[PDB]
Design a protein around this ligand. Structure first.
Ligand SMILES: CCCCCCCCCCCCCCCCCC(=O)OC[C@H](COP(=O)(O)OCCN)OC(=O)CCCCCCCCCCCCCCCCC
Ligand SMILES: CCCCCCCCCCCCCCCCCC(=O)OC[C@H](COP(=O)(O)OCCN)OC(=O)CCCCCCCCCCCCCCCCC
Ligand SMILES: CCCCCCCCCCCCCCCCCC(=O)OC[C@H](COP(=O)(O)OCCN)OC(=O)CCCCCCCCCCCCCCCCC
Ligand SMILES: CCCCCCCCCCCCCCCCCC(=O)OC[C@H](COP(=O)(O)OCCN)OC(=O)CCCCCCCCCCCCCCCCC
Ligand SMILES: CCCCCCCCCCCCCCCCCC(=O)OC[C@H](COP(=O)(O)OCCN)OC(=O)CCCCCCCCCCCCCCCCC
Ligand SMILES: CCCCCCCCCCCCCCCCCC(=O)OC[C@H](COP(=O)(O)OCCN)OC(=O)CCCCCCCCCCCCCCCCC
Ligand SMILES: CCCCCCCCCCCCCCCCCC(=O)OC[C@H](COP(=O)(O)OCCN)OC(=O)CCCCCCCCCCCCCCCCC
Ligand SMILES: CCCCCCCCCCCCCCCCCCCC
Ligand SMILES: CCCCCCCCCCCCCCCCCCCC
Ligand SMILES: CCCCCCCCCCCCCCCCCCCC
Ligand SMILES: CCCCCCCCCCCCCCCCCCCC
Lengths: 314, 478, 100, 102, 162, 299
């Protein structure tokens, strides 16, 4: 069984497994880190007693949610009710599956790339829809329709915000996108694309300030699946933002994974700071902002990016 | 192939109608004004109609791998634009009584006219498909424009479901044809076959499924059962547009497809089309025998007249005057249907609410509306193919084309269907003169349109040579 | 090394399944669902034909097909909502008042 | 090539292990621990707007990956497409189609 | 490549057969989404990568979302749909199923008599599709924008509430 | 002539009238059967809802849905039901269901001595404390014919203003939290802790000091209170300016708050609106100036 091809195949599979495990662990520790960083932003400490510095707290909520009684509503659709947290977890996990965290460390070097990310987000809206419908609660159903209408209103320009970076790279591939940032990171030319992508990524992840609730019926381990999937989506959106707008792993002195992890941690911290800092706008205001401001901004940014690209191609 | 400025000159009515769509849309966004938006729509359609002159002096060219502009496309573009302008003219006094928004009617009419122009210029399966749906979907809106009315909602639902089904059939047939041939241009459908192997089963199956879709679109038997319901339920200007522009554009693109495709010379396709034409003529004439509703009667009339047109289409590969017959017949049928549906629209206008019936009651029309009764009896005599009317000149062209190609079964079908049509058309025409128990310039404009259609029908019925010379001047590429 | 006939057969199977669902279902919603199955099957047939010939034309026809599918779904669901508003049922056999 | 088949195997293992991990999490949650209004049409309108503008977005997606090959002619065509898109959006906003509050 | 093609095609066939015979609308839409994902896998096995990406992005990510949305707005509890099961009666479906089977046999007989060198599965990227789209298919793009505009106007005119 | 004369404190199926002199004040024997019966009415209220007992009309135009927002409210203002008649998102009509926090405080006023009732006066407006004690002890002093000395007036004014700042800090922080900004409530409760340090030093208690007396206060001021007051007075203004700049000048908060639920002077007058809601209409009516008490003229 000793052959270089099989050794390389096993090494690549092991690298993908390591990436998956580190991402799920980082999502759970991101829940713990949201509690700690909210404590830091609010002049307090957060959980710092369960283990050293509170580091064993996440294990305590994991044990609590595992050994909590598993409960499904009596007049609920069991398959759809169980299926919603599956989607909420797996959709943005599989969206992470295209992220290049280091040169040579990627799971899938697809030719579609951020198209696969858009595939995953368009599937991810079904978690909210299914959680609202299957719970057999009219408050949960109304909240799910409002949340899904908001996410459609921002998913309508998520891809168009990425299209300026795609146009500059000339490709959908993520390695080509981070290689086109070898001199200047895409946050400088695609700045309006960057802010529109930030707004769309926060809105489709159901984060503050885009957060009658469609999770009130969930409990035990399904609620934990919803939360861990939300934090995995935070990590995935931050890593995609780093790769598409901040050079990915490229940096002057540090190893490439150190630069990627530092930039992803910075945007993770900015997610927490955005929750701690901004008030919640009204629903109609949020959706009018999504439709009237951001979508024309993405279209005009794409037009100007194309004009600059074709003018610079002598 | 790229686009040149000369290609842009050949693109002129399409560009003008699309610009009119955008301009009318932005004018509705500025402020809802029925008169201004209707005026902008008719100004754009008239601009496209007069830009056909610059298209003619641009010459005949291939503008895209998809479009081909020639005299054929010019004639069908002019017919589609005339039908759209008449639809807007009939639509304004009807929409004067409409309580909800009226401006979207003209936007949908303009987009459907754009689809008709694309079908006039279509040289490709992609452009044929796109032109068909660009006609169909604004007609989904227009047929159910008065969706509060029960009949209009019924007609809208029926038309939408059946047209989506026919679109699926047409696209599946196009996909099978593309799988056989490897190119989607009209001239390459059957070009990879030789030594008498033109009847390839996959190409024939694909063309059969496209025949299903197009025969839905042309109200041909046995895809005809939607026609009286959708004609009756739709608003009367929408019925005018659906009778004239949609049928004319789809028949023109079918004419071009069967002219250019080498598989149009197939014997099996010819026999299937002969069966469809025979059944369409006989069934449409028979089913209108006992109709007291003028709209359902005109729908069955449309089935019969499209059967006669298909008879002219069958002799395309054999005779030389088949497309000239199609042009003359389509001009006459357009003017006759414009007059008949316009009299119906003028007598149904203004829109008197969704809860009040829009029944015609044509009996005794001469004693309060004598000019409209004269126009409608001229149209009834024209649709019967009676001499001194242009419909007779079209029927004469169809019969000459059939006799030239020795299509004797279709010739006998035309004669028998003409006798049955004579019965019910004369019944309507004489009911206009029996005894039974407006005031703005747009209504007068609609009356002027139907009166001009009647005058044209009579004058070209007794002197058809200018129309014949114009149609012979519109020669497509050999 | 996938036969073109196998892809066309799969597309035809999906097409006739969608047409059967369109015919046998009294609900307008299931009729729209069957229409979507039919147009998606036809678009798959175009994709198979384009992939056999190595041309982008199959995917371009797919793009036009799904543009039509999206707009037709929009219009059909609007008409279905209007029907549910003005009749409180989706029985398509009840929408039959014009005949003869 | 060995690299592409290794990456295909890694992607397959990624999807399999992610789905299996979530399934095992649900199974362990079930096994462990002891036991004991009419929606408005604006929702449809917003979802319909999303569908239509997402199809126009796919057209722009196809344009964006091949901008340099299409040249300035493709820029003019996409500018016409985007202008039609923006005119439709302006029309939707001005007639109150995109106003949630009346 | 072929193995994925046959499994995805079988999954699409079985899911569509589950769709057209189901009584619950949300379950039927879920099976339809599964069939669309399977058809996207079929597209990816044939090298049509942009087609598969748009199959998930638009067909299974926008159109089915609209269908699901409308089903929630109706609150379809199977009123006179589940309580009748008219399509499950053999006297109702035996006719249309025989008609569809006859049409399938005719189409398959036409299909089997065509030249077939096989599908190579060479990936046709979205770059080539966009080159063709804004080259030889420009008027298709602009009039497709007009078609989507018409669909928008029609659906807004019909689907208002007042 | 009353449009709907139903019970507003007690439930509808209550026998007798509690404030009558022959009604016994004390708690009755608890019965699990009555609790189960009232639970059954709670579960059957969603089914047997009649939209005419509550004073409404047109109980489902076939689109007017109904919503309930209680009686489990996760907020500091308490828990109470509002049943909403909705046209989409618009509130056509709404009646509030109150009495879920009825403590019988007036009836207890008839059951406690003049001195032993003061802790009950604390718990009327439980964010007010000494502010709640002040009108009761002033009215009892009017009954007793007592004029308190000036130092009593200044002490009671100081404690009233400390508790007014405490209540206003809670109100502003909870409003900012209700808008959506979750951070300033932590710092506002730190400022409340500074106030509570001074109040604990003076009265021995935080929220219900019960420190005012008929004729004065319970104790003298402890030695060193001025240091705590000076420390709080140095602490407060920069924190207040920081809250203003961080949340109250936020345009998202302004869009959530400006123009929402507006009324004028006539509407405030006809509904008995007092406090900041009345004075925001331009009507200058504060009791501390219009009808001065407790030596407020000397400030
Ligand atoms: C913090 C310091 C970040 C410095 C930085 O962005 O460095 C990366 C890159 C430097 O250019 P580079 O060519 O990579 O230099 C090494 C030699 N090859 O720099 C760039 O490519 C420019 C990146 C500009 C980013 C501006 C916004 C940063 C986030 C706030
Ligand atoms: C009221 C009606 C509506 C009015 C309009 C409202 C909307 C406005 C939207 C504006 C959008 C502007 C987008 C500008 C992008 C221009 C930069 C760009 O795309 O450059 C591309 C180029 C890299 O491409 P290339 O060189 O081809 O690389 C591959 C090599 N073959 O990149 C480079 O070579 C590097 C170029 C760097 C340029 C940096 C400066 C421009 C971008 C940052 C703008 C910051 C604006 C800050 C706020 C201003 C006030 C709002
Ligand atoms: C950017 C590229 C080029 C684009 C195309 C060229 C520019 C297009 C500009 C369009 C302007 C639209 C707005 C016009 C406003 C007119 C205002 C006015 O005078 O309104 C009077 C009247 C209003 O209606 P009424 O009810 O009668 O009012 C009674 C109260 N006085 O209304 C009337 O009586 C009707 C007045 C009609 C005036 C306009 C007539 C010409 C329209 C030309 C464009 C039409 C489409 C062209 C297509 C391409 C042709 C090559
Ligand atoms: C020498 C023989 C071989 C050559 C033949 C050449 C053709 C010309 C000579 C033969 C003509 C025969 C015509 C027979 C029917 C005459 C029309 C007629 O009777 O119309 C009146 C009748 C309506 O009156 P009524 O009976 O009151 O109806 C009650 C309904 N509420 O109307 C009706 O009931 C409906 C009428 C429908 C249309 C008339 C029938 C058309 C049949 C085909 C005509 C073409 C000839 C084909 C060969 C036929 C057999 C010879
Ligand atoms: C709860 C579970 C629900 C179902 C989950 C999914 C079911 C299947 C799970 C097993 C999958 C086994 C592995 C599948 C193949 C992986 C490799 C692959 O896709 O390779 C093909 C292609 C490679 O591209 P490349 O090689 O770079 O191209 C150059 C030419 N060689 O790459 C591509 O073409 C990439 C595009 C295809 C990627 C598909 C990924 C899964 C999509 C479905 C997600 C479903 C999410 C959960 C449910 C949502 C709600 C329904
Ligand atoms: C295992 C038995 C069945 C078990 C139950 C069903 C589980 C899901 C099975 C379907 C999806 C996985 C199919 C297996 C894919 C394995 C990878 C593979 O075959 O890759 C080949 C090919 C790679 O690309 P290519 O470049 O052509 O490769 C040639 C080598 N140079 O690959 C390709 O070109 C495309 C790869 C497949 C397409 C992407 C994934 C599609 C996922 C569809 C899910 C549909 C919904 C499933 C719902 C299940 C529950 C009901
Ligand atoms: C990894 C990716 C993510 C990483 C995290 C970093 C990015 C986070 C992005 C957060 C985006 C939040 C967007 C919130 C938009 C809210 C729009 C809205 O509805 O505003 C309403 C408000 C008032 O509206 P109006 O109609 O005027 O009502 C007045 C009636 N009296 O209108 C207004 O107040 C007008 C201004 C509205 C807001 C403009 C946009 C602000 C965006 C948030 C600040 C971002 C700053 C940069 C953060 C760091 C980024 C690296
Ligand atoms: C929040 C970041 C999540 C990252 C998930 C994937 C982690 C992969 C770790 C790979 C580590 C090795 C990378 C290659 C070597 C270069 C760096 C060496 C020093 C770490
Ligand atoms: C065959 C071509 C058309 C010929 C002319 C058809 C009739 C056109 C309208 C002329 C005016 C009709 C007036 C009829 C008056 C009838 C009065 C009857 C009194 C009993
Ligand atoms: C109802 C219409 C009947 C039409 C009959 C026409 C008969 C034509 C026979 C032609 C025979 C040609 C033989 C060579
Ligand atoms: C209330 C209205 C219900 C209408 C149901 C219509 C059902 C039609 C079923 C048709 C069945 C055809 C069976 C096959 C016939 C022979 C093969 C085709 C002709 C050669």
């Amino acid at each position: 069984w000793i052959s270089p091809e099989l050794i390389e195949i096993l090494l690549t599979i092991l690298k993908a497994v390591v990436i998956l495990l580190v991402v799920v662990t980082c999502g759970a520790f991101m829940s713990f880190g949201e509690r700690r960083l909210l404590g830091l932003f609010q002049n307090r400490y957060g959980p710092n007693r369960v283990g050293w510095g509170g580091s064993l707290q996440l294990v305590a909520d994991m044990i609590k949610m595992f050994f909590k009684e598993d409960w499904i509503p009596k007049f609920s659709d069991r398959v759809i009710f169980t299926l919603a947290p599956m989607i909420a977890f797996t959709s943005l996990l599989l969206a992470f599956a295209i992220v290049p965290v280091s040169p040579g460390w990627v799971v899938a070097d697809l030719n579609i790339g951020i198209l696969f990310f858009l595939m995953m987000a368009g599937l991810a809206v079904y978690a909210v829809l299914f959680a609202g419908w299957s719970s057999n609660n009219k408050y949960s159903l109304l909240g799910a329709m409002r949340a899904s209408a908001q996410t459609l209103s921002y998913e309508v320009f998520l891809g168009l915000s990425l299209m300026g970076v795609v146009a500059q790279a000339g490709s959908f591939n993520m390695t080509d996108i981070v290689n086109s940032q070898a001199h200047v990171w895409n946050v400088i030319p695609q700045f309006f694309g960057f802010i529109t992508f930030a707004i769309a990524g926060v809105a489709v992840c159901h984060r503050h300030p885009f957060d009658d609730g469609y999770h009130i019926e969930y409990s035990g381990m399904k609620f934990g699946l919803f939360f861990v999937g939300e934090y995995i989506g935070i990590v995935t959106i931050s890593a995609l933002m780093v790769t598409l707008f901040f050079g990915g792993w490229q940096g002057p002195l540090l190893p490439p994974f150190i630069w990627f992890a530092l930039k992803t941690a910075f945007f993770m911290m900015m997610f927490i700071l955005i929750r701690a800092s901004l008030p919640r706008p009204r629903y109609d205001q949020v959706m009018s902002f999504g439709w009237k401001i951001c979508l024309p901004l993405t279209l005009i940014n794409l037009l100007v990016t194309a004009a600059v690209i074709l003018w610079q191609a002598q | 192939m790229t686009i040149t400025p000369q290609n842009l000159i050949a693109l002129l009515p399409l560009l003008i109608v699309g610009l009119t769509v955008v301009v009318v849309m932005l004018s509705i966004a500025w402020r809802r004004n029925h008169f201004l938006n209707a005026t902008l729509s008719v100004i754009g359609l008239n601009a496209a109609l007069v830009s056909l002159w610059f298209v003619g002096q641009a010459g005949a060219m291939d503008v895209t791998p998809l479009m081909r502009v020639d005299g054929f496309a010019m004639l069908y573009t002019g017919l589609v634009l005339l039908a759209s302008l008449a639809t807007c003219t009939f639509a304004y006094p009807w929409l004067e009584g409409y309580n909800d928004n009226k401006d979207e009617f003209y936007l949908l009419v303009l987009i459907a006219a754009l689809g008709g122009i694309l079908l006039a210029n279509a040289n490709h399966l992609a452009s044929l498909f796109l032109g068909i749906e660009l006609i169909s979907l604004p007609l989904f809106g227009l047929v159910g424009y008065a969706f509060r009315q029960k009949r209009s909602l019924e007609a809208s639902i029926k038309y939408t479901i059946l047209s989506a089904a026919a679109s699926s059939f047409l696209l599946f047939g196009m996909a099978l044809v593309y799988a056989q041939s490897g190119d989607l241009s009209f001239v390459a459908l059957g070009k990879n076959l030789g030594d008498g192997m033109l009847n390839e089963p996959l190409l024939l199956a694909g063309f059969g499924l496209m025949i299903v879709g197009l025969g839905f679109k042309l109200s041909l038997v046995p895809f005809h059962l939607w026609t009286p319901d959708v004609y009756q339920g739709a608003p009367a200007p929408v019925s005018t547009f659906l009778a004239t522009a949609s049928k004319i554009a789809i028949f023109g693109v079918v004419m071009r497809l069967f002219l250019y495709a080498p598989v149009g010379d197939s014997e099996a396709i010819r026999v299937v089309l002969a069966i469809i034409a025979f059944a369409s003529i006989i069934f449409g004439n028979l089913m209108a025998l006992s109709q007291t509703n003028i709209k359902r009667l005109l729908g069955y009339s449309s089935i019969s007249h499209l059967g006669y047109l298909l008879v002219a289409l069958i002799a395309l590969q054999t005779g030389e005057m088949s497309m000239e017959a199609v042009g003359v017949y389509l001009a006459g049928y357009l003017f006759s249907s414009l007059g008949a549906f316009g009299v119906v629209s003028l007598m149904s206008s203004p829109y008197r609410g969704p809860d009040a019936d829009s029944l015609f009651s044509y009996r005794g029309l001469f004693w309060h509306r004598p000019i409209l009764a004269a126009v409608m009896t001229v149209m009834m005599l024209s649709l019967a193919g009676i001499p001194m009317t242009l419909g007779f000149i079209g029927k004469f062209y169809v019969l000459a084309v059939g006799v030239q190609a020795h299509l004797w079964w279709l010739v006998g079908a035309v004669v028998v269907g003409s006798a049955i049509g004579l019965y019910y058309y004369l019944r309507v025409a004489v009911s206009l003169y029996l005894h039974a128990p407006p005031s703005n310039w747009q209504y007068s404009a609609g009356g002027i349109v139907v009166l001009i259609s009647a005058l044209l029908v009579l004058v070209l019925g007794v002197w058809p040579q200018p129309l014949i010379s114009i149609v012979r001047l519109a020669m497509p590429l050999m | 090394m996938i036969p073109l006939q196998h892809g066309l057969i799969l597309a035809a199977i999906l097409f006739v399944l969608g047409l059967t669902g369109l015919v046998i279902r009294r609900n307008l919603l299931f009729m729209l669902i069957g229409l979507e199955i039919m147009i998606n099957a036809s678009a798959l047939a175009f994709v198979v034909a384009g992939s056999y010939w190595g041309q982008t034309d199959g995917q371009v026809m797919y793009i036009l097909a799904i543009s039509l599918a999206a707009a037709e779904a929009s219009i059909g669901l609007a008409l279905l909502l209007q029907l549910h508003r003005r009749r409180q049922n989706l029985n398509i056999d009840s929408v039959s008042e014009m005949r003869g | 090539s060995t690299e592409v088949i290794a990456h295909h195997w890694a992607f397959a293992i990624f999807l399999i292990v992610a789905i299996g991990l979530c399934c095992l999490m649900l199974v362990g949650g079930w096994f462990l621990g002891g036991r004991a209004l009419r929606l408005s049409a604006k929702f449809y309108l917003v979802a319909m707007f999303f569908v239509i503008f997402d199809v126009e977005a796919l057209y722009l997606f196809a344009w964006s990956t091949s901008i340099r090959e299409s040249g300035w002619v493709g820029f003019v065509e996409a500018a016409i497409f985007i202008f039609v898109l923006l005119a439709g959006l302006v029309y939707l906003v001005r007639i109150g189609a995109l106003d949630w509050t009346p | 490549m072929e193995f994925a093609f046959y499994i995805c095609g079988l999954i699409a066939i079985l899911a569509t057969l589950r769709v057209i015979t189901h009584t619950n609308p949300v379950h039927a839409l879920l099976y339809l989404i599964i069939s669309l994902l399977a058809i996207s896998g079929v597209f990816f096995s044939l090298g049509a990568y942009f087609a598969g990406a748009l199959e998930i992005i638009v067909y299974a990510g926008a159109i089915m979302v609209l269908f699901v949305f409308v089903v929630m707005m109706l609150n379809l509890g199977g009123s006179e749909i589940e309580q009748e099961r008219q399509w499950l009666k053999p006297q109702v479906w035996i006719g249309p199923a025989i008609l569809s089977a006859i049409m399938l046999v005719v189409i398959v007989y036409a299909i089997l008599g065509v030249n077939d060198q096989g599908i190579d599965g060479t990936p046709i990227s979205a770059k080539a599709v966009g080159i063709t789209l804004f080259g030889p298919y420009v008027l298709a793009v602009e009039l497709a924008s007009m078609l989507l505009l018409a669909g928008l106007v029609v659906a807004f005119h019909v689907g208002r509430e007042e | 002539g009353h449009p709907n004369l139903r019970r507003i404190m007690m439930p509808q199926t209550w026998k007798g009238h509690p404030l009558r002199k022959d009604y016994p004040a004390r708690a009755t024997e608890f019965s699990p059967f009555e609790l189960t019966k009232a639970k059954q009415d709670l579960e059957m209220e969603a089914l047997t809802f009649k939209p005419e007992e509550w004073g409404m009309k047109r109980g489902t135009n076939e689109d007017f849905m109904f919503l309930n927002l209680g009686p489990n409210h996760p907020s500091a203002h308490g828990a109470f039901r509002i049943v909403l008649q909705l046209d989409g998102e618009e509130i056509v009509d709404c009646v509030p269901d109150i009495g879920y926090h009825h403590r019988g405080a007036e009836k207890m006023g008839e059951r406690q001595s003049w001195h032993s009732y003061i802790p009950y006066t604390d718990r009327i407006e439980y964010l007010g404390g000494c502010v709640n004690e002040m009108p009761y002890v002033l009215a009892v002093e009017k009954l007793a014919g007592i004029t308190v000395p000036d130092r009593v007036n200044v002490i009671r004014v100081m404690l009233s203003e400390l508790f007014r700042i405490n209540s206003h800090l809670l109100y502003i922080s909870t409003f900012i939290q209700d808008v959506g900004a979750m951070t300033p409530v932590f710092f506002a409760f730190t400022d409340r802790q500074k106030i509570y340090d001074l109040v604990e030093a003076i009265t021995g208690f935080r929220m219900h000091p019960a420190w005012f007396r008929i004729g004065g206060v319970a104790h003298d001021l402890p030695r060193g209170w001025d240091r705590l007051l000076r420390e709080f007075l140095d602490w407060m203004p920069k924190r207040l300016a920081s809250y203003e700049k961080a949340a109250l000048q936020n345009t998202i908060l302004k869009g959530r708050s400006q123009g929402v639920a507006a009324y004028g002077a006539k509407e405030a007058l006809e509904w008995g609106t007092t406090g900041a809601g009345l004075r925001a209409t331009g009507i200058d009516f504060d009791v501390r100036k219009a009808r001065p008490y407790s030596g407020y003229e000397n400030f």
